[PDB]
Amino acid sequence: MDDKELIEYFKSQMKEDPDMASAVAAIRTLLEFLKRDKGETIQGLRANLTSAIETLCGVDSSVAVSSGGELFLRFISLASLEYSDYSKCKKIMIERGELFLRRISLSRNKIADLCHTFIKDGATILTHAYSRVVLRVLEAAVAAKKRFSVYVTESQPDLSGKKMAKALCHLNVPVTVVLDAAVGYIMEKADLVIVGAEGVVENGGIINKIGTNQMAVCAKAQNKPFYVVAESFKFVRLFPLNQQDVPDKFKYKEEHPWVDYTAPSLITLLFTDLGVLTPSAVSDELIKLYL
Amino acid sequence: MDDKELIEYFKSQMKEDPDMASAVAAIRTLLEFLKRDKGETIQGLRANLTSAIETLCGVDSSVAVSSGGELFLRFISLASLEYSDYSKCKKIMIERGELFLRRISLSRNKIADLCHTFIKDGATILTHAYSRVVLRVLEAAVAAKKRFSVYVTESQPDLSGKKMAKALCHLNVPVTVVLDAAVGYIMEKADLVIVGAEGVVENGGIINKIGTNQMAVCAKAQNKPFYVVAESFKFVRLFPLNQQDVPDKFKYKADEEHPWVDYTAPSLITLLFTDLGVLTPSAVSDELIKLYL
Amino acid sequence: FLKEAARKRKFHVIVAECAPFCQGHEMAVNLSKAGIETTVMTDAAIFAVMSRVNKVIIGTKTILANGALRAVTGTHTLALAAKHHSTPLIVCAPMFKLSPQFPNEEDSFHKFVAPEEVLPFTEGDILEKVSVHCPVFDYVPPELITLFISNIGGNAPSYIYRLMSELYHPDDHVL
Numbered sequence: 001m002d003d004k005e006l007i008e009y010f011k012s013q014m015k016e017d018p019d020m021a022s023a024v025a026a027i028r029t030l031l032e033f034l035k036r037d038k039g040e041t042i043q044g045l046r047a048n049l050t051s052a053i054e055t056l057c058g059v060d061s062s063v064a065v066s067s068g069g070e071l072f073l074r075f076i077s078l079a080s081l082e083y084s085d086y087s088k089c090k091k092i093m094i095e096r097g098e099l100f101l102r103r104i105s106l107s108r109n110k111i112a113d114l115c116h117t118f119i120k121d122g123a124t125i126l127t128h129a130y131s132r133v134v135l136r137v138l139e140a141a142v143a144a145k146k147r148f149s150v151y152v153t154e155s156q157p158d159l160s161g162k163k164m165a166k167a168l169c170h171l172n173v174p175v176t177v178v179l180d181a182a183v184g185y186i187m188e189k190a191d192l193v194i195v196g197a198e199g200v201v202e203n204g205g206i207i208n209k210i211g212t213n214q215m216a217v218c219a220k221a222q223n224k225p226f227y228v229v230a231e232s233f234k235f236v237r238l239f240p241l242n243q244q245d246v247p248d249k250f251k252y253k254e255e256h257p258w259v260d261y262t263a264p265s266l267i268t269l270l271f272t273d274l275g276v277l278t279p280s281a282v283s284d285e286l287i288k289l290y291l
Numbered sequence: 292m293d294d295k296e297l298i299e300y301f302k303s304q305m306k307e308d309p310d311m312a313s314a315v316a317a318i319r320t321l322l323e324f325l326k327r328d329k330g331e332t333i334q335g336l337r338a339n340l341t342s343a344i345e346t347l348c349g350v351d352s353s354v355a356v357s358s359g360g361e362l363f364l365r366f367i368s369l370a371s372l373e374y375s376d377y378s379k380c381k382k383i384m385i386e387r388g389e390l391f392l393r394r395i396s397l398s399r400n401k402i403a404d405l406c407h408t409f410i411k412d413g414a415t416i417l418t419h420a421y422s423r424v425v426l427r428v429l430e431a432a433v434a435a436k437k438r439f440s441v442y443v444t445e446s447q448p449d450l451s452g453k454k455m456a457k458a459l460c461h462l463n464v465p466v467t468v469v470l471d472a473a474v475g476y477i478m479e480k481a482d483l484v485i486v487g488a489e490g491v492v493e494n495g496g497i498i499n500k501i502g503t504n505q506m507a508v509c510a511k512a513q514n515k516p517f518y519v520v521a522e523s524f525k526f527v528r529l530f531p532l533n534q535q536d537v538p539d540k541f542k543y544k545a546d547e548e549h550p551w552v553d554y555t556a557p558s559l560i561t562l563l564f565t566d567l568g569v570l571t572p573s574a575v576s577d578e579l580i581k582l583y584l
Numbered sequence: 585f586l587k588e589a590a591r592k593r594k595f596h597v598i599v600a601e602c603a604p605f606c607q608g609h610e611m612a613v614n615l616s617k618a619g620i621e622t623t624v625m626t627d628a629a630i631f632a633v634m635s636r637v638n639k640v641i642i643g644t645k646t647i648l649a650n651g652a653l654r655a656v657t658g659t660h661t662l663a664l665a666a667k668h669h670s671t672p673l674i675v676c677a678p679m680f681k682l683s684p685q686f687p688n689e690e691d692s693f694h695k696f697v698a699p700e701e702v703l704p705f706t707e708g709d710i711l712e713k714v715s716v717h718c719p720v721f722d723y724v725p726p727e728l729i730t731l732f733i734s735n736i737g738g739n740a741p742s743y744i745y746r747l748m749s750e751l752y753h754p755d756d757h758v759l
Contacts, residue, residue: 156447156470179549181447181471184504188534211472214505217512243476256469260476409688561726562650562686568754569686571650571726573742 003055006033011059019132022060023068023233024104029056030072031097040086045093049073061253063199063207067236074290075100107232107273108133112140115194115229115271121146123191129155129209130164131196133229137271138194142171149173151190153180155209157258180211187218197230197270201238202286204264204279206230207246216262225268232273235286292327294346301347310423312489314355314524315395317347318363322388325367331377333368336384340364352544354490354498354552359395359524365583366391394566398522399424401566403431406520409562415481416441417510420500421451422487424520426458428564429485433464440465442481446502447471448549471502478509488521488563490541492529493579495557495572497521498537501550507559519555520564526579585641585676585733590620598637600627602656604720605701627658631665640666641674645721647682649748649757651741652726654693657719663728673729679736684748684757687723694719 006029014025033052037045053069076096083089115137119125125148127134138150150173154161162177169175178186193215199207206212206228219226240246243260251257264279271277274285300323304316324343328336344360367384374380406428410416416439418425429441441459445452445468456468469477478484484506490498497503497519510517531537531554542550557572564570567578586597597620601608612624625633642662644655653675666673687693699716732739739747 153472154447156445156472176547179447179501181444181502181505182550182553183472184506184508184555185501185534185550185553187504210470210476212475214472214475214478214509217475217509218505221508221512242479244480254467256473257476260473409686411688411691558727568757569649571742571745574745577746 001036001038006052007055007059010056014060021064021132021231022062023064024101026056026060026065026068027072027097027101027104027233030069031094031101034090034094034097037090042081042083042086042089046073046077057249061249063236063250063259064234067199068233071233071235071290072097072100078291103273104231104233108136110273111229111231111271112136114273114276115227116141116144116146118192118227118271119146119148120191121148123148124189125150126186126190126193126215127152127164128161128193128195128212128215129153130160130167131229133231134194134196135164135168137229138168138173139171142173149176151176151178151186153178153183153211153215155211156180157210157256183211183215183218187215187222187224190219190224193219193224193226195226195228197228197234198259199234199236200228200230200270200282200286201236201240201261202283203239204270204282205262205267206270207236207250207259207261210257210260213243213260213262216266219268220266226266227269227271228267229271230282235282235289237286237290292324292329294343296327297324297343297346298350301350312355312423312522312524313351313353314359315392317351317356317359318388318392318395318524320347321360321363322385322392325381325388326385328381331374331381333372333374333377333380336381337364337368340367348540352540354527354529354541355525358490358527361528362524362526362583363388363391369584395522395524398524398566399427400431402520402522402564403428405566405569406518406564407432407435407437409518410437410439410483410485412438414439414483417477417481417484417506417515418443418455419452419486419502419506420444420446421455421458422520424522425485425487426455428520429459429464430462433462440467442467442469442477444469444471444474444502444506446500448501448551451500474502474506475509478506478513478515481515483516483518484510485518485520488519488525489552490525490527490529491519491521491563491565491575491579492527492531492554493576494530495560495563495575496531496555497560497563498527498529498531498541498552498554501553504534504553504555507555511559516561517559518562518564519560523566523582526565526575526582528579528583587615587618587620591618594619594621596621596623596637598623598625598633600625600630600658600662602658602720603627604657604697604718607656627662630658630662631668634662634665634669634671637666637669637671639674640671641676644675644677644681644724647675647677647732647744649684649686649745650726651729651732651744652687652724653677653681653729654721654723657722660722660724663724667728672731674731674733675729676733679734679747679751682744682747682751684752693723694721696720 010029014022056065076093081089119141152161152165165175165177197206240261246261270282301320304320348357367387372380410432441464443452443456452468456466459466488497488499544551560572599608599612599622612622615622642659644653647653697718697720699718702718703716726741729741
């Protein structure tokens with residue numbers, strides 16, 4: 001009911017598996033919460049969901065979880081209810097939630113078999129951080145039997161890019177763990193950039209691990225392409241104009257951030273399970289997705 | 292002086308005072324070596340000096356060392372010699388080398404007195420590493436009662452930024468050590484970025500510690516005017532064009548890994564600082580062909 | 585320059601006027617007194633007309649030791665425009681307009697004149713909380729100009745820091 005076990009179940013699930021992303025565990029916790037609601041209303045649920053979201057934004061601050069909660073609460077109330085007895089509402093809403101979580105699950109697979117046709121065999125993937133979606137993109141790019149060298153910058157705030165490097169070279173790919181300060185160097189020999197995404201703001205540029213923006217502009221420096229892969233529930237309706245504009249609950253968690261903003265004029269294309277989008281299209285489909 | 296006395300004397304010159312550039316130590320050790328002549332023949336002398344430069348770079352391949360030693364050889368034999376006896380000539384050479392080392396000692400304070408007229412009031416300086424030149428110019432800017440703050444990037448391989456942060460809060464200046472990846476984040480609130488070159492090729496760029504190229508290109512993205520301080524014993528004669536065009540004898544310095552030093556083009560740099568004055572990176576080319584003669 | 589290089593040809597001279605106090609207007613009258621097809625315009629719409637212009641001759645007040653001259657106001661925005669349309673910047677300055685200081689050497693590098701010409705005193709009460717700036721000299725950066733017409737010929741922003749040593753000394757920078 002209350003956070004006293006809601007939050008514990010959330011953490012247990014989210015940390016049961018690393019391939020299991022965070023905000024999808026948030027969605028699943030909201031669903032089990034509905035499965036243990038024990039109440040008679042809908043308004044009180046339009047408020048109790050927000051309560052669970054605000055107790056979830058503390059255990060995790062990533063734009064992922066806020067996006068997941070908001071978008072799920074939005075879409076769940078889409079098939080016109082016309083309540084019968086606060087029970088038909090229950091069935092139809094849990095059905096909407098099941099359908100949404102399954103869409104979420106297959107988002108990664110869809111973006112996998114949609115992305116793999118972009119690594120021009122014999123190229124240089126330059127990722128930036130351990131990101132399940134980039135990982136299972138490169139997996140389906142080696143399954144279709146291409147070849148490519150992967151530079152994973154190390155993401156100084158926590159040397160976790162090494163985790164991507166290890167789990168990736170587990171798949172027999174030539175990996176090279178560059179210095180994340182060297183993203184001015186290896187950019188001479190990066191045929192494309194595939195950065196994992198943790199949420200997309202409206203205008204198209206995205207919120208990503210600290211070392212993204214620099215890499216981003218480095219791309220636009222040397223006219224390389226910059227590609228992102230944002231899972232389907234990583235949309236938020238912020239709209240920053242400079243790295244300080246993003247909400248402070250997101251950046252922090254001396255003075256050094258953790259996520260920052262890549263302006264849209266640098267991203268060349270986005271790969272979501274909603275297809276392939278020039279950023280203007282992500283503005284459009286974000287408006288018409290939240291509705 | 293079979294080159295083991297050479298290197299042991301160089302390490303002594305290092306640990307006696309670690310702060311100074313490796314290259315001024317290189318020139319001092321080459322001068323002391325020159326005093327340990329054992330023979331007055333101009334030719335076998337400069338051949339000995341070149342072998343000495345080679346055995347020097349064999350332990351500290353920082354572009355500083357090679358640049359400085361070659362400039363040393365350039366400036367020793369400037370005037371005529373008329374070596375009718377070859378010993379008074381070596382006296383003249385020791386004298387000229389001493390004058391050269393005096394100019395190298397004046398480099399820092401010349402930089403300090405020419406530069407700090409550029410940090411306008413209430414700005415946020417950004418740097419990248421333990422550029423003792425930038426440290427002393429920052430001191431000569433704060434002690435002129437200017438007001439600013441300062442950010443610094445830890446420069447992961449060896450966390451030099453942290454050591455500079457220590458030696459800068461020791462100067463009572465508001466200093467923050469941000470992650471080296473975050474050079475893009477901060478690049479908007481920090482007005483101008485000062486950094487200290489360790490090599491200045493003919494075109495006008497620099498060859499500085501690993502986290503420089505990204506910093507230059509970011510501070511050219513968001514139009515934050517760049518400034519690099521570089522003293523007159525680091526005017527190299529290279530000319531890279533890409534990252535692969537800095538020779539391996541400069542990059543790794545060690546003897547699925549990382550480089551150490553890398554390039555930055557003369558368009559991403561606004562004004563260079565030498566004890567020859569303030570230069571726009573084409574002045575590097577002109578004054579370099581005129582300095583090497 | 586123009587009214588000599590236009591008694592052979594006839595062509596387009598789009599004279600902007602300095603908005604603080606109209607300066608290009610007697611310029612326009614003097615040009616038109618020989619019939620040069622002069623089109624006067626307010627300095628606020630340059631980025632409008634800039635894309636139908638070919639050579640950007642700007643008259644400057646003085647140059648620096650970067651080439652980054654500082655000239656009559658509104659020339660920096662004209663330079664940003666005429667680089668956004670990649671036209672040349674054909675400066676026309678003789679030698680004596682060249683001083684070997686550097687850009688950020690003068691606190692208030694500009695020259696603020698009496699705000700009375702921007703919001704004349706006859707306004708009234710609102711003159712109590714209005715910092716009416718009026719910087720009548722603006723600072724062109726180095727990399728926006730391409731061609732100095734000095735009276736020795738054409739030159740480029742990197743054949744200036746040698747006109748110093750050819751004309752002045754090093755230690756006369758502070759005078």
